[PDB]
Write a protein that holds these residues in place. Sequence first.
Motif, PDB file in Angstrom:
ATOM      1  N   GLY A   3      15.344 -13.530 -17.332  1.00 32.71           N
ATOM      2  CA  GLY A   3      16.589 -12.372 -17.327  1.00 32.71           C
ATOM      3  C   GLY A   3      16.998 -11.984 -16.409  1.00 32.71           C
ATOM      4  N   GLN A   4      17.369 -10.744 -16.084  1.00 28.41           N
ATOM      5  CA  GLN A   4      17.943 -10.247 -15.144  1.00 28.41           C
ATOM      6  C   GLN A   4      16.633  -9.759 -14.523  1.00 28.41           C
ATOM      7  N   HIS A   5      16.461  -9.601 -12.905  1.00 28.59           N
ATOM      8  CA  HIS A   5      15.874  -9.229 -12.071  1.00 28.59           C
ATOM      9  C   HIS A   5      16.306  -8.245 -10.867  1.00 28.59           C
ATOM     10  N   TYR A 132      11.741  -3.359 -23.603  1.00 29.74           N
ATOM     11  CA  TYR A 132      12.623  -3.497 -22.156  1.00 29.74           C
ATOM     12  C   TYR A 132      12.817  -4.544 -21.372  1.00 29.74           C
ATOM     13  N   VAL A 133      11.540  -5.344 -22.236  1.00 33.17           N
ATOM     14  CA  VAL A 133      12.282  -7.068 -21.466  1.00 33.17           C
ATOM     15  C   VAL A 133      11.822  -8.033 -22.583  1.00 33.17           C
ATOM     16  N   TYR A 190       7.482 -13.914 -12.892  1.00 34.82           N
ATOM     17  CA  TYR A 190       7.847 -13.651 -14.615  1.00 34.82           C
ATOM     18  C   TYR A 190       7.967 -14.869 -15.607  1.00 34.82           C
ATOM     19  N   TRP A 217       7.309  -5.406 -14.048  1.00 33.44           N
ATOM     20  CA  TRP A 217       8.622  -5.739 -15.247  1.00 33.44           C
ATOM     21  C   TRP A 217       9.269  -5.267 -15.765  1.00 33.44           C
ATOM     22  N   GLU A 220      10.751  -2.618 -13.107  1.00 32.56           N
ATOM     23  CA  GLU A 220      12.261  -3.321 -13.310  1.00 32.56           C
ATOM     24  C   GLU A 220      13.353  -3.433 -13.968  1.00 32.56           C
ATOM     25  N   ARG A 221      13.253  -3.304 -14.685  1.00 26.79           N
ATOM     26  CA  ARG A 221      14.201  -2.938 -16.003  1.00 26.79           C
ATOM     27  C   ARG A 221      14.457  -1.641 -16.524  1.00 26.79           C
ATOM     28  N   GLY A 224      15.865  -0.541 -11.810  1.00 26.03           N
ATOM     29  CA  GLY A 224      17.307  -1.630 -11.251  1.00 26.03           C
ATOM     30  C   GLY A 224      16.498  -1.540 -10.156  1.00 26.03           C
TER      31      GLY A 224
END
Lengths: 384, 384
Positions: A3-5, A132-133, A190, A217, A220-221, A224
């Motif tokens: 996913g997005q990082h 969240y993840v 990750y 992680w 971060e989610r 951002g």
Amino acid sequence: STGQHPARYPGAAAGEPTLDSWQEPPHNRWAFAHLGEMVPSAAVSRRPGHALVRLGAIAAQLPDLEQRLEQTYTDAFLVLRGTEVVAEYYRAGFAPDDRHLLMSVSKSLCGTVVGVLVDEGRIDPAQPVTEYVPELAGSVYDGPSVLQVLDMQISIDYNEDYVDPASEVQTHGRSAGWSTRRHGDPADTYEFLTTLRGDGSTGEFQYCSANTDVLAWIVERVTGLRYVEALSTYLWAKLDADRDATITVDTTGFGCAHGGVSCTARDLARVGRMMLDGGVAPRGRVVSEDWVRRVLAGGSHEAMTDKGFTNTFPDGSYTRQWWCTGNERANVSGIGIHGQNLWLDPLTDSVIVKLSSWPDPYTEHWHRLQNGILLDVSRALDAV
Amino acid sequence: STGQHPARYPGAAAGEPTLDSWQEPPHNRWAFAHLGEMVPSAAVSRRPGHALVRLGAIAAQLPDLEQRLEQTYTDAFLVLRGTEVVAEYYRAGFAPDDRHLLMSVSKSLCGTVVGVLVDEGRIDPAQPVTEYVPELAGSVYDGPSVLQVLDMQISIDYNEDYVDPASEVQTHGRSAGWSTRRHGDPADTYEFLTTLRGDGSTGEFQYCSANTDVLAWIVERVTGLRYVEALSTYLWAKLDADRDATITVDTTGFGCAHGGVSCTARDLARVGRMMLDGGVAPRGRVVSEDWVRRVLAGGSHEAMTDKGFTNTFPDGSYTRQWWCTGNERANVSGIGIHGQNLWLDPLTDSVIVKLSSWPDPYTEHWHRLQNGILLDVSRALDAV
């Protein structure tokens, strides 16, 4: 897919730059100002062989303290009573403002960042990690709550045998860039985390470094921000620290939340000072009074079945990335291998920092000696 | 074999620690205090989007200067007239005290360290490289003098085609840890240097980064210090710099003398200030008046056949790791790819630092624009 990082810099493609692309545009504008994130680098000192020994008042009560510090491979030692530095020691070759790897004391810093976001209502500890993840679905982190990660009450198949390259602990290290990569290894931290499995049970304490990187992680989610930046924005920048901290980063720029922070002893003490000030730092509140109260109160005793801890601290526990001794002083400590402590002594409003390099990451022997020093120093601070 | 090298720490075995051993005793006592030398690491800022523009007086004479700086991808720009900072510019996202990679401006710093040792009679430029590094026997550096290395007047088979992995330039980079290793690659920079060959001719300028790393190797054999420490002891620590510099290190801890130094613009200017002060820094003499005179005087013009330089500077030359323009101001400059300059303007007792990130390492276009800026700024400093 994980996913997005957070991009390494504004507008950066996923995973860019790498060791093989940092010289190329557009990466090089960022990389030229941050090269240590890509290539191992040494300091060239702006300043032009003897231990610094300033053990202050406690010296009289603990005459053999320097020898005891030497015997436990002490690199830096500092006692902050209230706002005052009342005792200091640095080994020959280590300057007072040199930085030192924190190992798992890093975890307590990460938990603090999570705490800030819980205060803001951006993280709900009761919610599953997957809220969240989502990409941790299908892993051992599919099902457990964020609080169970914070308290490390998740059963995980994580082999701690560091002499076996196939072990999770070694694989985690290679994924983090702490050791040379082997064929088949996950691409980054990750990906490594998504490979972890367990029998599904929760509720019993199992100390596992994967938990802390999952917390980072999540951070971060939710924000951002790169974990490196989150750790600065939510904690380090509020301390009025003498120096930046540093943190190792893996190939994506993900900071090793679980173990990779380095800082000075005096600056680490500022984190303890914040905790004993109800969560407030010089430049603003870091975490809530409630969060600090919960840390100081301890975790579930039933959950704590690690005899390596309870043999010394029968009523001990673990919560929110802190070890809670449950002793008669209710001491609480960040702890890292080879002898790192951020030790809190609320009774005397004091913080003890001990940063060391024992030859071994852990033995009962080392912890007996180290805990003996921290307790003796704490008691030496009592009014008489 | 490449012979004796300075240990990473007191008592360390050759080549120790590596990425795979730094956690083990006895290495870990050192590594825990210097982890960035082993593992890529990020700064966690102690401080909590707009360009800083303070172009001072020259702004009136050069109204479009900010645009010209933007167009040449300027990250940091600083003009020191005498002891006074009279103009500054930093791009959005780059702080005044952020550090920036110097690329080949690094070479001029290395040459300065060599100069100190020449002053002390510890290096004789007339002597062959092999007087100091016997292990370079059988290489292109078997025969040439140290001065010929300093002036880069050695013919070397060194392919500068960086799109070819087999090229010397790419192999040099992998040996230095700037890029991912490939099978067959030399183990470190020392070994890489011993593989270099040439037709044996000398006397004509050939710009080659291998030369500077040979100089650093000589420095290490003469002093017994790691180049990282030599650069601090003989130069950086005498400047009264605001910050440490940094330098990338290869797997043996050998600093990339030819290109791997980073520092702040203001601190780099202190090096130029030292040069215009006849070799004296705030904390003591760095190099002799004679050494500085020889740098400012220039190298052999006959030797300089690089039209990339002489097209702009017909009477230009190169000596002791500095480019000498031979223009009517007798400007002398450290130069690095993607737009780095430590530019000396003795006429006005001024130093200009420009640190940039052009998308390309070199084009005629970029150098025309960059040199136009440096000359216009120099002339703006003239009395009127």
